[PDB]
Design a protein around this nucleic acid. Structure first.
Length: 187
DNA sequence: GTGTGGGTGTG
């Protein structure tokens, strides 16, 4: 028919299926990006839980440390038509006065030292057998908006994410850009 | 339940 709502899950809270398909909201921190493709700006987010779907390589979002990597069950790829990306970057330009392009140093496009935790509704489906997830929205969820974008359960889940990254992302890395990562928090 | 999955590494 023509009437559905927007559910929410997180890798482990998935539920898709081969012939299936649906919409879901994943919360996580951006770690990489690829605006070179003329079809969109490939993005790789990350958070807690563990993906159980087959998905694809999902790269490894080489954390700030280019020494080791992580599994493809912790991060995932996110995309959105450049127009959808502009609308998304616009939400960020208000928290950074600039677009993602203004965030990167001007060379590569992957970002994993700012965090930029945000929520986004994505449309998932099996592309030949893999989970093809796109991004329908892209609202930023730093700190002055989290309590205005989430609250019921999703709020603590978001708070629990910052606790993990603090010890998982590597305490030595936060020292390389402590001020850039602390955004507006007392580290 | 839409299209924009590329990769797969790591910068």
């Amino acid at each position: 028919k023509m009437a559905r709502k927007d559910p929410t899950i997180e890798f482990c809270q998935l539920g898709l299926d081969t012939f299936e398909t649906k919409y879901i909201t994943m919360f996580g921190m951006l770690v990489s990006c690829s605006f070179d493709k003329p079809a969109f700006i490939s993005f790789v987010f990350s958070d807690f839980t563990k993906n159980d779907i087959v998905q694809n390589y999902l790269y490894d979002r080489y954390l700030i440390d280019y020494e080791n990597k992580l599994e493809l069950n912790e991060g995932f790829k996110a995309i959105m038509y450049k127009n959808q990306f502009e609308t998304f970057d616009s939400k960020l330009r208000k928290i950074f006065n600039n677009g993602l392009r203004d965030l990167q140093n001007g060379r590569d496009e992957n970002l994993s030292q700012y965090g930029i935790v945000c929520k986004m509704n994505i449309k998932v489906k099996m592309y030949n057998g893999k989970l093809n997830a796109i991004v329908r929205e892209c609202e930023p969820v730093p700190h002055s908006q989290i309590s205005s974008i989430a609250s019921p359960s999703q709020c603590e889940h978001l708070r629990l994410f910052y606790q993990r990254a603090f010890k998982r992302i590597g305490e030595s890395a936060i020292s390389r850009y402590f001020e850039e990562y602390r955004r507006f928090f007392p580290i």
